[PDB]
JSON list of C-alpha atoms and ligand atoms in Angstrom, two decimals:
[
{"chain": "A", "resi": 1, "resn": "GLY", "atom": "CA", "xyz": [56.40, 118.20, 75.31]},
{"chain": "A", "resi": 2, "resn": "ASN", "atom": "CA", "xyz": [53.82, 120.91, 74.68]},
{"chain": "A", "resi": 3, "resn": "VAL", "atom": "CA", "xyz": [54.87, 124.57, 74.65]},
{"chain": "A", "resi": 4, "resn": "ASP", "atom": "CA", "xyz": [52.41, 127.39, 75.32]},
{"chain": "A", "resi": 5, "resn": "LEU", "atom": "CA", "xyz": [54.11, 130.62, 74.22]},
{"chain": "A", "resi": 6, "resn": "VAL", "atom": "CA", "xyz": [52.85, 134.17, 74.75]},
{"chain": "A", "resi": 7, "resn": "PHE", "atom": "CA", "xyz": [54.17, 137.25, 72.96]},
{"chain": "A", "resi": 8, "resn": "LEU", "atom": "CA", "xyz": [53.85, 140.28, 75.26]},
{"chain": "A", "resi": 9, "resn": "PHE", "atom": "CA", "xyz": [54.42, 143.35, 73.11]},
{"chain": "A", "resi": 10, "resn": "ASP", "atom": "CA", "xyz": [54.93, 147.04, 73.84]},
{"chain": "A", "resi": 11, "resn": "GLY", "atom": "CA", "xyz": [52.32, 149.39, 72.33]},
{"chain": "A", "resi": 12, "resn": "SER", "atom": "CA", "xyz": [53.65, 152.60, 73.91]},
{"chain": "A", "resi": 13, "resn": "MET", "atom": "CA", "xyz": [53.51, 156.14, 72.48]},
{"chain": "A", "resi": 14, "resn": "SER", "atom": "CA", "xyz": [57.24, 156.11, 71.63]},
{"chain": "A", "resi": 15, "resn": "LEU", "atom": "CA", "xyz": [56.75, 153.52, 68.87]},
{"chain": "A", "resi": 16, "resn": "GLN", "atom": "CA", "xyz": [56.50, 154.76, 65.29]},
{"chain": "A", "resi": 17, "resn": "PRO", "atom": "CA", "xyz": [54.03, 152.93, 62.96]},
{"chain": "A", "resi": 18, "resn": "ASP", "atom": "CA", "xyz": [56.84, 151.08, 61.15]},
{"chain": "A", "resi": 19, "resn": "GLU", "atom": "CA", "xyz": [58.56, 150.14, 64.45]},
{"chain": "A", "resi": 20, "resn": "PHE", "atom": "CA", "xyz": [55.28, 148.74, 65.82]},
{"chain": "A", "resi": 21, "resn": "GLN", "atom": "CA", "xyz": [54.81, 146.78, 62.58]},
{"chain": "A", "resi": 22, "resn": "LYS", "atom": "CA", "xyz": [58.35, 145.36, 62.83]},
{"chain": "A", "resi": 23, "resn": "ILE", "atom": "CA", "xyz": [57.46, 144.01, 66.30]},
{"chain": "A", "resi": 24, "resn": "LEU", "atom": "CA", "xyz": [54.33, 142.37, 64.86]},
{"chain": "A", "resi": 25, "resn": "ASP", "atom": "CA", "xyz": [56.34, 140.95, 61.94]},
{"chain": "A", "resi": 26, "resn": "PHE", "atom": "CA", "xyz": [58.86, 139.33, 64.31]},
{"chain": "A", "resi": 27, "resn": "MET", "atom": "CA", "xyz": [55.98, 137.68, 66.17]},
{"chain": "A", "resi": 28, "resn": "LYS", "atom": "CA", "xyz": [54.48, 136.48, 62.87]},
{"chain": "A", "resi": 29, "resn": "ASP", "atom": "CA", "xyz": [57.90, 135.18, 61.71]},
{"chain": "A", "resi": 30, "resn": "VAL", "atom": "CA", "xyz": [58.30, 133.05, 64.85]},
{"chain": "A", "resi": 31, "resn": "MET", "atom": "CA", "xyz": [54.75, 131.67, 64.66]},
{"chain": "A", "resi": 32, "resn": "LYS", "atom": "CA", "xyz": [55.00, 130.85, 60.94]},
{"chain": "A", "resi": 33, "resn": "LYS", "atom": "CA", "xyz": [58.29, 129.00, 61.47]},
{"chain": "A", "resi": 34, "resn": "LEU", "atom": "CA", "xyz": [56.73, 126.97, 64.31]},
{"chain": "A", "resi": 35, "resn": "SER", "atom": "CA", "xyz": [53.42, 126.18, 62.57]},
{"chain": "A", "resi": 36, "resn": "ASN", "atom": "CA", "xyz": [52.16, 122.59, 62.91]},
{"chain": "A", "resi": 37, "resn": "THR", "atom": "CA", "xyz": [54.38, 121.84, 65.93]},
{"chain": "A", "resi": 38, "resn": "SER", "atom": "CA", "xyz": [53.77, 121.32, 69.66]},
{"chain": "A", "resi": 39, "resn": "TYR", "atom": "CA", "xyz": [53.79, 125.14, 70.02]},
{"chain": "A", "resi": 40, "resn": "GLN", "atom": "CA", "xyz": [50.58, 127.09, 70.47]},
{"chain": "A", "resi": 41, "resn": "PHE", "atom": "CA", "xyz": [50.47, 130.85, 70.84]},
{"chain": "A", "resi": 42, "resn": "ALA", "atom": "CA", "xyz": [48.78, 133.86, 72.40]},
{"chain": "A", "resi": 43, "resn": "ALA", "atom": "CA", "xyz": [49.61, 137.56, 71.94]},
{"chain": "A", "resi": 44, "resn": "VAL", "atom": "CA", "xyz": [49.07, 140.40, 74.40]},
{"chain": "A", "resi": 45, "resn": "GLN", "atom": "CA", "xyz": [49.59, 144.11, 73.70]},
{"chain": "A", "resi": 46, "resn": "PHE", "atom": "CA", "xyz": [50.61, 146.20, 76.70]},
{"chain": "A", "resi": 47, "resn": "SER", "atom": "CA", "xyz": [50.90, 149.93, 77.23]},
{"chain": "A", "resi": 48, "resn": "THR", "atom": "CA", "xyz": [49.07, 151.57, 80.14]},
{"chain": "A", "resi": 49, "resn": "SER", "atom": "CA", "xyz": [46.75, 148.56, 80.15]},
{"chain": "A", "resi": 50, "resn": "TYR", "atom": "CA", "xyz": [46.56, 145.18, 78.42]},
{"chain": "A", "resi": 51, "resn": "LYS", "atom": "CA", "xyz": [44.74, 143.48, 75.55]},
{"chain": "A", "resi": 52, "resn": "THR", "atom": "CA", "xyz": [44.82, 139.81, 74.64]},
{"chain": "A", "resi": 53, "resn": "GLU", "atom": "CA", "xyz": [44.89, 140.24, 70.87]},
{"chain": "A", "resi": 54, "resn": "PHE", "atom": "CA", "xyz": [44.37, 136.50, 70.45]},
{"chain": "A", "resi": 55, "resn": "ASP", "atom": "CA", "xyz": [44.46, 133.55, 72.83]},
{"chain": "A", "resi": 56, "resn": "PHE", "atom": "CA", "xyz": [45.56, 129.92, 72.48]},
{"chain": "A", "resi": 57, "resn": "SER", "atom": "CA", "xyz": [42.09, 128.79, 71.37]},
{"chain": "A", "resi": 58, "resn": "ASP", "atom": "CA", "xyz": [42.14, 131.50, 68.68]},
{"chain": "A", "resi": 59, "resn": "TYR", "atom": "CA", "xyz": [45.49, 130.17, 67.49]},
{"chain": "A", "resi": 60, "resn": "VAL", "atom": "CA", "xyz": [44.25, 126.54, 67.33]},
{"chain": "A", "resi": 61, "resn": "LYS", "atom": "CA", "xyz": [41.19, 127.63, 65.32]},
{"chain": "A", "resi": 62, "resn": "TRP", "atom": "CA", "xyz": [42.98, 129.90, 62.81]},
{"chain": "A", "resi": 63, "resn": "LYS", "atom": "CA", "xyz": [46.66, 128.81, 62.70]},
{"chain": "A", "resi": 64, "resn": "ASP", "atom": "CA", "xyz": [47.30, 131.98, 60.68]},
{"chain": "A", "resi": 65, "resn": "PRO", "atom": "CA", "xyz": [49.53, 134.69, 62.23]},
{"chain": "A", "resi": 66, "resn": "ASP", "atom": "CA", "xyz": [48.57, 137.24, 59.54]},
{"chain": "A", "resi": 67, "resn": "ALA", "atom": "CA", "xyz": [44.84, 136.82, 60.27]},
{"chain": "A", "resi": 68, "resn": "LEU", "atom": "CA", "xyz": [45.30, 136.67, 64.05]},
{"chain": "A", "resi": 69, "resn": "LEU", "atom": "CA", "xyz": [47.15, 140.01, 64.23]},
{"chain": "A", "resi": 70, "resn": "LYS", "atom": "CA", "xyz": [45.39, 141.84, 61.36]},
{"chain": "A", "resi": 71, "resn": "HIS", "atom": "CA", "xyz": [43.20, 143.97, 63.65]},
{"chain": "A", "resi": 72, "resn": "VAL", "atom": "CA", "xyz": [45.68, 145.08, 66.32]},
{"chain": "A", "resi": 73, "resn": "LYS", "atom": "CA", "xyz": [45.33, 148.76, 67.23]},
{"chain": "A", "resi": 74, "resn": "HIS", "atom": "CA", "xyz": [48.43, 150.56, 68.54]},
{"chain": "A", "resi": 75, "resn": "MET", "atom": "CA", "xyz": [47.56, 151.73, 72.08]},
{"chain": "A", "resi": 76, "resn": "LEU", "atom": "CA", "xyz": [50.04, 154.66, 72.09]},
{"chain": "A", "resi": 77, "resn": "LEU", "atom": "CA", "xyz": [50.27, 155.09, 75.87]},
{"chain": "A", "resi": 78, "resn": "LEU", "atom": "CA", "xyz": [52.70, 154.15, 78.68]},
{"chain": "A", "resi": 79, "resn": "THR", "atom": "CA", "xyz": [54.76, 151.03, 79.54]},
{"chain": "A", "resi": 80, "resn": "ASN", "atom": "CA", "xyz": [53.34, 149.18, 82.55]},
{"chain": "A", "resi": 81, "resn": "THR", "atom": "CA", "xyz": [55.55, 146.10, 82.22]},
{"chain": "A", "resi": 82, "resn": "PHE", "atom": "CA", "xyz": [55.09, 144.75, 85.76]},
{"chain": "A", "resi": 83, "resn": "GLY", "atom": "CA", "xyz": [51.29, 144.86, 85.44]},
{"chain": "A", "resi": 84, "resn": "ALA", "atom": "CA", "xyz": [51.50, 143.36, 81.95]},
{"chain": "A", "resi": 85, "resn": "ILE", "atom": "CA", "xyz": [53.57, 140.32, 82.97]},
{"chain": "A", "resi": 86, "resn": "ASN", "atom": "CA", "xyz": [51.18, 139.76, 85.88]},
{"chain": "A", "resi": 87, "resn": "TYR", "atom": "CA", "xyz": [48.22, 140.01, 83.47]},
{"chain": "A", "resi": 88, "resn": "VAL", "atom": "CA", "xyz": [49.78, 137.31, 81.26]},
{"chain": "A", "resi": 89, "resn": "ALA", "atom": "CA", "xyz": [50.43, 135.03, 84.26]},
{"chain": "A", "resi": 90, "resn": "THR", "atom": "CA", "xyz": [46.91, 135.34, 85.74]},
{"chain": "A", "resi": 91, "resn": "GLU", "atom": "CA", "xyz": [44.61, 136.17, 82.78]},
{"chain": "A", "resi": 92, "resn": "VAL", "atom": "CA", "xyz": [46.22, 134.58, 79.70]},
{"chain": "A", "resi": 93, "resn": "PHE", "atom": "CA", "xyz": [47.88, 131.32, 80.79]},
{"chain": "A", "resi": 94, "resn": "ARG", "atom": "CA", "xyz": [44.47, 129.86, 81.58]},
{"chain": "A", "resi": 95, "resn": "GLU", "atom": "CA", "xyz": [42.81, 126.60, 80.54]},
{"chain": "A", "resi": 96, "resn": "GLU", "atom": "CA", "xyz": [39.63, 128.60, 79.81]},
{"chain": "A", "resi": 97, "resn": "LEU", "atom": "CA", "xyz": [41.56, 130.36, 77.03]},
{"chain": "A", "resi": 98, "resn": "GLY", "atom": "CA", "xyz": [43.09, 127.21, 75.54]},
{"chain": "A", "resi": 99, "resn": "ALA", "atom": "CA", "xyz": [46.25, 126.89, 77.66]},
{"chain": "A", "resi": 100, "resn": "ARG", "atom": "CA", "xyz": [47.30, 123.27, 78.09]},
{"chain": "A", "resi": 101, "resn": "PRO", "atom": "CA", "xyz": [47.81, 121.85, 81.59]},
{"chain": "A", "resi": 102, "resn": "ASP", "atom": "CA", "xyz": [51.45, 120.96, 82.32]},
{"chain": "A", "resi": 103, "resn": "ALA", "atom": "CA", "xyz": [52.73, 122.54, 79.08]},
{"chain": "A", "resi": 104, "resn": "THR", "atom": "CA", "xyz": [56.05, 124.37, 79.16]},
{"chain": "A", "resi": 105, "resn": "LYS", "atom": "CA", "xyz": [55.19, 128.07, 79.47]},
{"chain": "A", "resi": 106, "resn": "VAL", "atom": "CA", "xyz": [57.24, 130.65, 77.55]},
{"chain": "A", "resi": 107, "resn": "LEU", "atom": "CA", "xyz": [57.03, 134.44, 77.41]},
{"chain": "A", "resi": 108, "resn": "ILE", "atom": "CA", "xyz": [58.65, 136.62, 74.78]},
{"chain": "A", "resi": 109, "resn": "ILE", "atom": "CA", "xyz": [58.46, 140.21, 76.01]},
{"chain": "A", "resi": 110, "resn": "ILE", "atom": "CA", "xyz": [59.19, 142.91, 73.40]},
{"chain": "A", "resi": 111, "resn": "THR", "atom": "CA", "xyz": [59.72, 146.49, 74.58]},
{"chain": "A", "resi": 112, "resn": "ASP", "atom": "CA", "xyz": [61.24, 149.88, 73.60]},
{"chain": "A", "resi": 113, "resn": "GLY", "atom": "CA", "xyz": [61.32, 151.56, 77.02]},
{"chain": "A", "resi": 114, "resn": "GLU", "atom": "CA", "xyz": [61.81, 151.19, 80.76]},
{"chain": "A", "resi": 115, "resn": "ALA", "atom": "CA", "xyz": [58.80, 150.12, 82.82]},
{"chain": "A", "resi": 116, "resn": "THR", "atom": "CA", "xyz": [56.58, 152.99, 83.98]},
{"chain": "A", "resi": 117, "resn": "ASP", "atom": "CA", "xyz": [55.29, 150.93, 86.93]},
{"chain": "A", "resi": 118, "resn": "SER", "atom": "CA", "xyz": [56.77, 148.83, 89.76]},
{"chain": "A", "resi": 119, "resn": "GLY", "atom": "CA", "xyz": [56.17, 145.80, 91.98]},
{"chain": "A", "resi": 120, "resn": "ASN", "atom": "CA", "xyz": [57.09, 142.19, 91.35]},
{"chain": "A", "resi": 121, "resn": "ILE", "atom": "CA", "xyz": [56.53, 139.44, 88.79]},
{"chain": "A", "resi": 122, "resn": "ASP", "atom": "CA", "xyz": [56.40, 136.52, 91.28]},
{"chain": "A", "resi": 123, "resn": "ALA", "atom": "CA", "xyz": [53.13, 135.28, 89.71]},
{"chain": "A", "resi": 124, "resn": "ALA", "atom": "CA", "xyz": [54.99, 134.71, 86.41]},
{"chain": "A", "resi": 125, "resn": "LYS", "atom": "CA", "xyz": [58.17, 133.11, 87.77]},
{"chain": "A", "resi": 126, "resn": "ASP", "atom": "CA", "xyz": [57.46, 129.57, 86.49]},
{"chain": "A", "resi": 127, "resn": "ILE", "atom": "CA", "xyz": [57.32, 130.93, 82.94]},
{"chain": "A", "resi": 128, "resn": "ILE", "atom": "CA", "xyz": [60.49, 130.85, 80.84]},
{"chain": "A", "resi": 129, "resn": "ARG", "atom": "CA", "xyz": [60.91, 134.56, 80.14]},
{"chain": "A", "resi": 130, "resn": "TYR", "atom": "CA", "xyz": [62.80, 136.20, 77.27]},
{"chain": "A", "resi": 131, "resn": "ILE", "atom": "CA", "xyz": [62.90, 139.98, 76.94]},
{"chain": "A", "resi": 132, "resn": "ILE", "atom": "CA", "xyz": [63.86, 141.96, 73.85]},
{"chain": "A", "resi": 133, "resn": "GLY", "atom": "CA", "xyz": [64.70, 145.61, 74.53]},
{"chain": "A", "resi": 134, "resn": "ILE", "atom": "CA", "xyz": [64.94, 147.69, 71.36]},
{"chain": "A", "resi": 135, "resn": "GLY", "atom": "CA", "xyz": [66.19, 151.12, 70.38]},
{"chain": "A", "resi": 136, "resn": "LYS", "atom": "CA", "xyz": [67.55, 154.40, 71.72]},
{"chain": "A", "resi": 137, "resn": "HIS", "atom": "CA", "xyz": [65.92, 154.10, 75.17]},
{"chain": "A", "resi": 138, "resn": "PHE", "atom": "CA", "xyz": [68.30, 151.20, 75.88]},
{"chain": "A", "resi": 139, "resn": "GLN", "atom": "CA", "xyz": [71.46, 153.05, 74.87]},
{"chain": "A", "resi": 140, "resn": "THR", "atom": "CA", "xyz": [72.97, 152.97, 78.38]},
{"chain": "A", "resi": 141, "resn": "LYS", "atom": "CA", "xyz": [74.07, 149.81, 80.21]},
{"chain": "A", "resi": 142, "resn": "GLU", "atom": "CA", "xyz": [72.01, 151.11, 83.16]},
{"chain": "A", "resi": 143, "resn": "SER", "atom": "CA", "xyz": [68.75, 151.07, 81.16]},
{"chain": "A", "resi": 144, "resn": "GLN", "atom": "CA", "xyz": [69.50, 147.59, 79.78]},
{"chain": "A", "resi": 145, "resn": "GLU", "atom": "CA", "xyz": [70.06, 146.31, 83.34]},
{"chain": "A", "resi": 146, "resn": "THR", "atom": "CA", "xyz": [66.49, 147.34, 84.31]},
{"chain": "A", "resi": 147, "resn": "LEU", "atom": "CA", "xyz": [65.17, 144.57, 82.04]},
{"chain": "A", "resi": 148, "resn": "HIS", "atom": "CA", "xyz": [67.03, 141.79, 83.89]},
{"chain": "A", "resi": 149, "resn": "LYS", "atom": "CA", "xyz": [64.39, 141.49, 86.64]},
{"chain": "A", "resi": 150, "resn": "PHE", "atom": "CA", "xyz": [61.71, 140.55, 84.08]},
{"chain": "A", "resi": 151, "resn": "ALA", "atom": "CA", "xyz": [63.69, 137.75, 82.39]},
{"chain": "A", "resi": 152, "resn": "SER", "atom": "CA", "xyz": [64.74, 134.24, 83.38]},
{"chain": "A", "resi": 153, "resn": "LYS", "atom": "CA", "xyz": [68.36, 133.70, 84.49]},
{"chain": "A", "resi": 154, "resn": "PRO", "atom": "CA", "xyz": [71.04, 134.20, 83.34]},
{"chain": "A", "resi": 155, "resn": "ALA", "atom": "CA", "xyz": [70.43, 137.58, 81.67]},
{"chain": "A", "resi": 156, "resn": "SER", "atom": "CA", "xyz": [73.22, 136.70, 79.20]},
{"chain": "A", "resi": 157, "resn": "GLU", "atom": "CA", "xyz": [70.78, 134.15, 77.75]},
{"chain": "A", "resi": 158, "resn": "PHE", "atom": "CA", "xyz": [67.31, 135.66, 78.27]},
{"chain": "A", "resi": 159, "resn": "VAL", "atom": "CA", "xyz": [67.88, 139.41, 77.75]},
{"chain": "A", "resi": 160, "resn": "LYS", "atom": "CA", "xyz": [68.36, 140.58, 74.15]},
{"chain": "A", "resi": 161, "resn": "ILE", "atom": "CA", "xyz": [69.33, 144.22, 73.54]},
{"chain": "A", "resi": 162, "resn": "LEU", "atom": "CA", "xyz": [68.84, 145.44, 69.96]},
{"chain": "A", "resi": 163, "resn": "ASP", "atom": "CA", "xyz": [70.02, 148.86, 68.80]},
{"chain": "A", "resi": 164, "resn": "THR", "atom": "CA", "xyz": [67.42, 149.09, 66.00]},
{"chain": "A", "resi": 165, "resn": "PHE", "atom": "CA", "xyz": [64.06, 147.57, 65.04]},
{"chain": "A", "resi": 166, "resn": "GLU", "atom": "CA", "xyz": [65.70, 146.37, 61.80]},
{"chain": "A", "resi": 167, "resn": "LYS", "atom": "CA", "xyz": [67.78, 144.06, 64.04]},
{"chain": "A", "resi": 168, "resn": "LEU", "atom": "CA", "xyz": [64.65, 141.98, 64.78]},
{"chain": "A", "resi": 169, "resn": "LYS", "atom": "CA", "xyz": [65.35, 140.32, 61.42]},
{"chain": "A", "resi": 170, "resn": "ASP", "atom": "CA", "xyz": [68.86, 139.41, 62.56]},
{"chain": "A", "resi": 171, "resn": "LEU", "atom": "CA", "xyz": [67.48, 138.11, 65.88]},
{"chain": "A", "resi": 172, "resn": "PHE", "atom": "CA", "xyz": [65.03, 135.87, 63.99]},
{"chain": "A", "resi": 173, "resn": "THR", "atom": "CA", "xyz": [67.94, 134.61, 61.85]},
{"chain": "A", "resi": 174, "resn": "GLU", "atom": "CA", "xyz": [69.85, 133.71, 65.04]},
{"chain": "A", "resi": 175, "resn": "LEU", "atom": "CA", "xyz": [66.78, 132.15, 66.73]},
{"chain": "A", "resi": 176, "resn": "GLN", "atom": "CA", "xyz": [66.22, 129.77, 63.80]},
{"chain": "A", "resi": 177, "resn": "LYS", "atom": "CA", "xyz": [69.72, 128.31, 64.17]},
{"chain": "A", "resi": 178, "resn": "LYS", "atom": "CA", "xyz": [68.45, 126.95, 67.50]},
{"chain": "A", "resi": 179, "resn": "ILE", "atom": "CA", "xyz": [65.60, 124.96, 65.90]},
{"chain": "A", "resi": 180, "resn": "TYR", "atom": "CA", "xyz": [65.94, 121.16, 66.04]},
{"chain": "A", "resi": 181, "resn": "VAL", "atom": "CA", "xyz": [63.97, 117.97, 65.66]},
{"chain": "A", "resi": 182, "resn": "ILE", "atom": "CA", "xyz": [64.44, 116.35, 69.08]},
{"chain": "B", "resi": 1, "resn": "LIG", "atom": "C1", "xyz": [61.05, 125.87, 75.54]},
{"chain": "B", "resi": 1, "resn": "LIG", "atom": "N1", "xyz": [61.79, 127.01, 75.00]},
{"chain": "B", "resi": 1, "resn": "LIG", "atom": "C2", "xyz": [61.40, 127.63, 73.84]},
{"chain": "B", "resi": 1, "resn": "LIG", "atom": "O1", "xyz": [60.43, 127.27, 73.21]},
{"chain": "B", "resi": 1, "resn": "LIG", "atom": "C3", "xyz": [62.19, 128.81, 73.30]},
{"chain": "B", "resi": 1, "resn": "LIG", "atom": "C4", "xyz": [63.58, 128.84, 73.50]},
{"chain": "B", "resi": 1, "resn": "LIG", "atom": "C5", "xyz": [64.35, 129.90, 73.03]},
{"chain": "B", "resi": 1, "resn": "LIG", "atom": "C6", "xyz": [63.76, 130.97, 72.34]},
{"chain": "B", "resi": 1, "resn": "LIG", "atom": "N2", "xyz": [64.55, 131.99, 71.91]},
{"chain": "B", "resi": 1, "resn": "LIG", "atom": "N3", "xyz": [65.83, 131.85, 71.49]},
{"chain": "B", "resi": 1, "resn": "LIG", "atom": "C7", "xyz": [66.36, 132.96, 71.15]},
{"chain": "B", "resi": 1, "resn": "LIG", "atom": "C8", "xyz": [67.78, 133.08, 70.66]},
{"chain": "B", "resi": 1, "resn": "LIG", "atom": "C9", "xyz": [68.68, 132.09, 71.07]},
{"chain": "B", "resi": 1, "resn": "LIG", "atom": "C10", "xyz": [70.03, 132.14, 70.69]},
{"chain": "B", "resi": 1, "resn": "LIG", "atom": "C11", "xyz": [70.49, 133.21, 69.90]},
{"chain": "B", "resi": 1, "resn": "LIG", "atom": "C12", "xyz": [71.95, 133.29, 69.47]},
{"chain": "B", "resi": 1, "resn": "LIG", "atom": "O2", "xyz": [72.60, 132.25, 69.56]},
{"chain": "B", "resi": 1, "resn": "LIG", "atom": "N4", "xyz": [72.51, 134.44, 69.03]},
{"chain": "B", "resi": 1, "resn": "LIG", "atom": "C13", "xyz": [73.92, 134.49, 68.63]},
{"chain": "B", "resi": 1, "resn": "LIG", "atom": "C14", "xyz": [74.38, 135.94, 68.29]},
{"chain": "B", "resi": 1, "resn": "LIG", "atom": "C15", "xyz": [75.81, 135.93, 67.61]},
{"chain": "B", "resi": 1, "resn": "LIG", "atom": "N5", "xyz": [76.11, 137.28, 67.10]},
{"chain": "B", "resi": 1, "resn": "LIG", "atom": "C16", "xyz": [69.59, 134.21, 69.50]},
{"chain": "B", "resi": 1, "resn": "LIG", "atom": "C17", "xyz": [68.24, 134.15, 69.88]},
{"chain": "B", "resi": 1, "resn": "LIG", "atom": "C18", "xyz": [65.36, 134.05, 71.39]},
{"chain": "B", "resi": 1, "resn": "LIG", "atom": "C19", "xyz": [65.35, 135.44, 71.22]},
{"chain": "B", "resi": 1, "resn": "LIG", "atom": "C20", "xyz": [64.16, 136.11, 71.56]},
{"chain": "B", "resi": 1, "resn": "LIG", "atom": "C21", "xyz": [63.05, 135.41, 72.05]},
{"chain": "B", "resi": 1, "resn": "LIG", "atom": "C22", "xyz": [63.09, 134.01, 72.20]},
{"chain": "B", "resi": 1, "resn": "LIG", "atom": "C23", "xyz": [64.27, 133.33, 71.86]},
{"chain": "B", "resi": 1, "resn": "LIG", "atom": "C24", "xyz": [62.37, 130.95, 72.14]},
{"chain": "B", "resi": 1, "resn": "LIG", "atom": "C25", "xyz": [61.59, 129.89, 72.62]},
{"chain": "B", "resi": 2, "resn": "LIG", "atom": "MG1", "xyz": [58.09, 153.11, 74.60]}
]
């Protein structure tokens, strides 16, 4: 039961330095909690374009979330979520980059705005997809609904709407209550 998990994180211009860091901290928190397990990780920043900040092979080598994310540079551009999810599916979940054949694939998408592009995420549909939408851009129910298409079903399970970046701590608290030895 191997799990290959990718964090796909928003690096758009809307994000303040502390908000961007809170996103990184949440990613680190999850990885640290799941150290020395069947989980292996990759992280991809997305804005207008995409950057694999570290891949699965990097994670195996270092096993240190602080070191792996120490040299991330905030892109400060747009929010091309469709393109980003497609990039993960076709350019990140790859054996060449340390992905394990037949592993359970998981995506955690973290964003603070509506997608600035369009299309489909068919290429990523076999990945278990969570999306975390954070902050004032997701005030309306309408804006929150736009995230449903990116996530696995039902949205009640896979879509998390947080009013503040501080709430990432509370989300991590909740997530950990779902951790079991099987
Ligand atoms: C193979 N699958 C996996 O490895 C795998 C499976 C699940 C996840 N999860 N799980 C959560 C989660 C689940 C439940 C609750 C909750 O019960 N809240 C109650 C609120 C009461 N006021 C809160 C958060 C989550 C959130 C963001 C991203 C990924 C997440 C990650 C990886
Ligand atoms: Mg934004």
